[PDB]
């Protein structure tokens, strides 16, 4: 039986659009360039796969003849993206697929569905997270992951599961992001850790969270992470991603427990100022932060390109300090706090600083120090830059 079915334009176009993002560009095996359509029992299944990441979504469908077909993914995406808002009639006829919408008519050559690899079966679903919380946490941590495939061991997000607690981490050796959150476990309690490619996980957080809840699949019991695969399911969309076989550093030990100095200031203000003074820095060379008497003196630049400085009111408690940072790394941290005010926790100009959201307890603390580190769900440790 050849596939004959009618679908809604927006449904088919959205599904194809999403499944098409995971498609490989000019893959080794030609069939990998195709999208798989399988219609049955008043539904259509649209799938893509590249041996590293898989995307599968199911949409409503008026089935006239259940069947399966494989068509060029990018071409299907371009076509579906330009169809008029009318029903989409899909009908496989021999070696070609007939796609009809409005007065437009397309006839494409099918692909070798037999040569197409079987999709990976997702492990057992371990737990479920609110979609917005998951998206925020991942977005907050991923900024700290490495972005260089020549250093793959840095390009991951560590996912720790301990009962109802989940800890996400990421680093590139110069900055560390950690987010603690709670989820609803769907299996007996687990105590496992894996390393997921950050780009794929963030992609799933942005484009994969179609619903309000997000189920994650890593296994069950002792076989959590054994399959080397992570499943991510939502309302209709389910994807898979290969795990990274690399060790994540020990980060709990680098998180300071006390701070000699502390500086609270507004995120928007600080961000704008950093981006302004950084205009004269030598390609994100460094920004100099001079804290003293509740005033933050920002400066940067050389005498050959130019130098800039700007003063900002700041709630600074502790010993005066002069510490420098990479502008991009700094604004990356500030942009992940998602709070009105940021609180820095400095030690020495040559040791990490703790950017974290401001808490009510910080307005209170004021003295000579030392000050104890506050408990916070998200933390962004940033290594400073050596000054001349």
């Amino acid at each position: 039986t050849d596939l004959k079915v009618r679908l809604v334009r927006d449904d088919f176009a959205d599904a194809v659009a999403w499944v098409a993002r995971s498609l490989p560009s000019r893959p080794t095996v030609p069939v990998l360039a195709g999208v798989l359509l399988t219609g049955s029992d008043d539904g259509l299944t649209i799938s893509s796969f590249d041996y590293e990441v898989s995307a599968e979504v199911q949409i409503p469908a008026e089935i006239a003849a259940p069947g399966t077909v494989l068509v060029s993914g990018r071409l299907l995406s371009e076509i579906t993206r330009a169809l008029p808002n009318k029903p989409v009639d899909l009908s496989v006829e021999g070696t070609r697929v007939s796609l009809t919408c409005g007065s437009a008519r397309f006839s494409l050559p099918t692909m070798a569905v037999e040569d197409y690899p079987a999709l990976p079966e997702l492990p057992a679903e371990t737990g479920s997270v609110p979609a917005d919380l998951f998206a925020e946490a991942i977005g907050q941590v991923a900024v700290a992951a490495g972005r260089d495939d020549t250093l793959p061991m840095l390009t991951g997000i560590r996912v720790e599961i301990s009962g109802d607690r989940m800890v996400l981490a990421a680093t590139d050796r110069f900055r560390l992001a950690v987010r603690e959150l709670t989820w609803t476990t769907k299996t007996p309690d687990v105590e496992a850790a894996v390393l997921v490619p950050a780009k794929t996980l963030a992609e799933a957080a942005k484009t994969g969270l179609d619903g309000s809840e997000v189920q994650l699949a890593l296994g069950a019991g002792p076989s959590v992470g054994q399959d080397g695969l992570l499943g991510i399911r939502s309302e209709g969309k389910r994807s898979t991603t290969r795990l990274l076989d690399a060790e994540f550093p020990k980060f709990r030990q680098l998180l300071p427990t006390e701070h000699t100095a502390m500086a609270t200031i507004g995120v928007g203000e600080l961000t704008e100022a950093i981006k302004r003074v950084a205009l004269v820095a030598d390609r994100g060379a460094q920004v100099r932060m001079e804290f003293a008497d509740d005033v933050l003196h920002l400066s940067a630049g050389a005498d050959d390109v130019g130098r800039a400085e700007e003063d900002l009111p700041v709630s600074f408690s502790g010993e005066p300090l002069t510490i420098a940072f990479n502008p991009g790394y700094l604004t990356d941290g500030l942009g992940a706090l998602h709070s009105e005010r940021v609180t820095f926790g400095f030690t020495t100009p040559s040791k990490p600083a703790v950017l974290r959201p401001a808490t009510e307890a910080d307005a209170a603390l004021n003295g000579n120090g030392p000050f104890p580190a506050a408990e916070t769900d998200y933390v962004y440790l940033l290594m400073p830059v050596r000054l001349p």
Binding site: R173, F174, R175, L176, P249, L254, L381, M383, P384, V385
Partner: peptide, 6 residues
């Protein structure tokens, strides 16, 4: 630029 780990 210093590093957190190696």
């Amino acid at each position: 630029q210093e590093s957190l780990f190696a």
